[PDB]
Design a binder for these strands. Sequence first.
DNA 1: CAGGATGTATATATCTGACACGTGCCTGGAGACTAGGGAGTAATCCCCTTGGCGGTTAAAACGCGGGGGACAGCGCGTACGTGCGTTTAAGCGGTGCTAGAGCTGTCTACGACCAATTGAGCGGCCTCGGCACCGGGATTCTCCA
DNA 2: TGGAGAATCCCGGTGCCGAGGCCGCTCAATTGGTCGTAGACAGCTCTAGCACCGCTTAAACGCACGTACGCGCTGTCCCCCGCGTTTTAACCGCCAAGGGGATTACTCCCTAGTCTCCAGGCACGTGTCAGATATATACATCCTG
Lengths: 93, 93, 104, 104, 80, 80, 96, 96
Amino acid sequence: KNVETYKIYIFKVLKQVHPDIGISSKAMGIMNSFINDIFEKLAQESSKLARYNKKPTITSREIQTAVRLVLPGELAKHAVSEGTKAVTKFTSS
Amino acid sequence: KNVETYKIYIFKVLKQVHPDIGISSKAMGIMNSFINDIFEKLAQESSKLARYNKKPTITSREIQTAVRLVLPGELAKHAVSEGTKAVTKFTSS
Amino acid sequence: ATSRSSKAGLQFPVGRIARFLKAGKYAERVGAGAPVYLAAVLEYLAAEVLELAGNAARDNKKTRIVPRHIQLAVRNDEELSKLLGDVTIANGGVMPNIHNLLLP
Amino acid sequence: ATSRSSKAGLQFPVGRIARFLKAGKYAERVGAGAPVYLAAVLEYLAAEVLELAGNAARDNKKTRIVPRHIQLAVRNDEELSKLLGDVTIANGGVMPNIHNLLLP
Amino acid sequence: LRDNIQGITKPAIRRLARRGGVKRISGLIYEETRGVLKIFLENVIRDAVTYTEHARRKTVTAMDVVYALKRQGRTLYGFG
Amino acid sequence: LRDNIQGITKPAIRRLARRGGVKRISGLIYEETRGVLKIFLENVIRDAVTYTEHARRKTVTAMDVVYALKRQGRTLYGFG
Amino acid sequence: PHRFRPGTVALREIRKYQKSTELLIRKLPFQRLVREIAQDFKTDLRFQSSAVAALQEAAEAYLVGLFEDTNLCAIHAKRVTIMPKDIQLARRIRGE
Amino acid sequence: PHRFRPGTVALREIRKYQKSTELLIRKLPFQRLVREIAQDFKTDLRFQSSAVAALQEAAEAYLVGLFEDTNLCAIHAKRVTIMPKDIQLARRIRGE
DNA sequence: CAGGATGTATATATCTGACACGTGCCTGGAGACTAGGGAGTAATCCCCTTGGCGGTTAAAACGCGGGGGACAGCGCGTACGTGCGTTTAAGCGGTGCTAGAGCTGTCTACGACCAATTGAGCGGCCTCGGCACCGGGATTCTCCA
DNA sequence: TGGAGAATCCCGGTGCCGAGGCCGCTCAATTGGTCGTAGACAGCTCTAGCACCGCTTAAACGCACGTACGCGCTGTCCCCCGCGTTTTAACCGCCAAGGGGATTACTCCCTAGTCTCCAGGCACGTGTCAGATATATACATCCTG
């Protein structure tokens, strides 16, 4: 069965940030599991947030508030900035 | 708005176990919120268990395994016994 | 129309708990026995906590259970204190405990 | 047919993340902008962790990132340490830290 | 509002210590306790304000504080 | 299987302490560490066996152990 | 005049305060402090009374637990007087 | 014969083992111990090798953290030798 | 021991505001019932987990001096408890004020969803290249001196 | 400092198996309609949060003082570290069985979905009562004495 993973995109980000640095498959798996864990955390936070306000839909606002609840400090601020920039780019074209 | 709570059933259980002992409204609120918290914990444990096995159904087995995961030790054993007894009584009658 | 609670011999509201299980959208489908099992577990836990709280109230020579007695009941039993380790009870106070080396 | 990730300028799979959001049954409806925002946040976190790990590998004077470098990067950064305080990284080792009173 | 951390006076910290079983207290304990209390309150209030802002409200509800405390593993009963 | 707790030898405990920054080790540290290790392993294995039994399996997989560790707030990477 | 030996009134206070469930911090100073702290996150906020009460209850419970751990650390060091190093050690072990 | 002063080899081992990522407990004894423990919960169980490896990794990490906290507790008491009371205090503060 | 205060309990009225109990009604439960989907079950196979085994090495065991750290005892001075007026700011009840949570229509954007469609991604092979390791040299620590 | 004595580092070959690429191929992401839906958006309304003020008192608070605890020191001894020598058990390679868990059909049954009753549970009206609460009143209790 096809096991879907973020390896290609993690490699793309690495080559975008470190052009000449490679990565071992062990670190690949560690990074993939870290991404999965963060995804799960943010998704459950957004779902609980929706349940609290009785909203049946998950919007970018729920994701933003879950980011602010889960990520700490300057990390959360920068993540919110990139998320807002990407959403603006998406809905602008 | 009608707000559902376990006050009547908690009072019934108290009168079943302590016939002559009363209870204050603060204790009712505390007990009700304790029941709500335990219910929530067991429900999320059952939902995670269902997601792990790709089963879209929550059966009594999921509740039993959530009980064993959440409640500790002899408390969990007693809870499992009472749950099985109640399920058997419901099914056979 | 006999209620499911009385059918299973439970004081807790099997019907209400089934409705809550459906409303939370924990899964697409819920079994017929899941609300009964969950109601039984909840009733057992409530009975245990109320039993210890009533005993604590009796040892205090009061008839009426108050949050102080519930806090005492929670911290007296090992199992519930393990389950409720990270929990603070409103108006519960603390267990009276003075270290041996602090005594005169 | 341009991909949503390319439209939003993200490396991460906006479409795959949208599918993951729907399949997880987190909510009955999922907004259009939620997968894009989530993909951007995931890309930012991955870029941060990979940057710190690459820097740690460079200080180690190796050209490949290994779990030891990831552990060092995690334990060097403050907010990442707060986010990953309770995590254990396979083959990560420990931060070299010897207390002052133990020194001769 | 300014300098309200000094509102946690020495007798209040001494009573909090007595409830905790403490027999003697040093001088700098009061300042250390004020610092740690400020840290804890900052964390909890940050989470509560985030919850309030998400709901598009301007009044911090008790349920927001309960959720914020729950997120830190400090479940509080009696305010549900 | 019997008495395999003694398989955690004194050199193993000493190496674990050295990795942790310990300079000197008392005699009873080895027995205390064996006891605490038994407690930790008992908890984790209990949760893992519960997860295995739920899935109607008889082989404890690595994913069961990962879930059991995650339930205690000790999430482990590299075994996903 | 009659003077009790040091520690007698301390033990009396320990026995007294562990028996009561009252709040030990004055309500108005804590309310003002909470408002001052919340002013840094979002301006012009209003607080429900039950919210401030819950905050005070949680803060007092947390401080009581912290002082229990501090007393344990002080007893460990063969001392009865608690010191800032004890609080720092307790917080470090708790992971704060 | 040449003899290093007591303690020197201790810091040498400290520096060496904090630099490596290898496993410090032998694999077979830990596997036997895990099987013996699991025998009490459900009989006739089989273990994947990755499951035992994950258990060993988690146990070693937990023990390393516990020994770090134990060293902090021992240093707090103006000692360098860690003692069972230090482990007991560390576990008590952690809530275990 | 022992007397003299000293809070600390130890009874005792007492009243009051905090709760068990009516009340009505409507919004949950119970029943009926059906179609489709999930789950149990039955087979089935191959791969992974166990078990054995033998050689053989490096780690664990096993004494064992020796040094260095725990640790009990010991002065000592200071900082913390403890009385003691004093003042001040929290409490508290009442009152005005206002702003914003909550609720209620309403409709328009906005998302599910499915049937083609197609493009990217995942598994199964090639391949070569960073890196682990391993002797020897260089360096560096570290005890002794 | 300085020399031995061992420890750490480091470089050069040398081997090497694991990343990086690549290639069929399949699935999943994109598109394209299409229509319930839901959530924002005004509008409103009442209520709770705020603002304030008088006043009083009891808690904070500054200070003087007495005391007992931290704490460094001072031997002192014992028991943990370092270090050889056995010895043994972990390890590792491998192979044969075996069994068990996914997996694939496959049938059937059970739960949602809905609708029609129907019923019990839930916010104000009663009424009343155990519990706080001063108030004397013993009861330990503890520092002197």
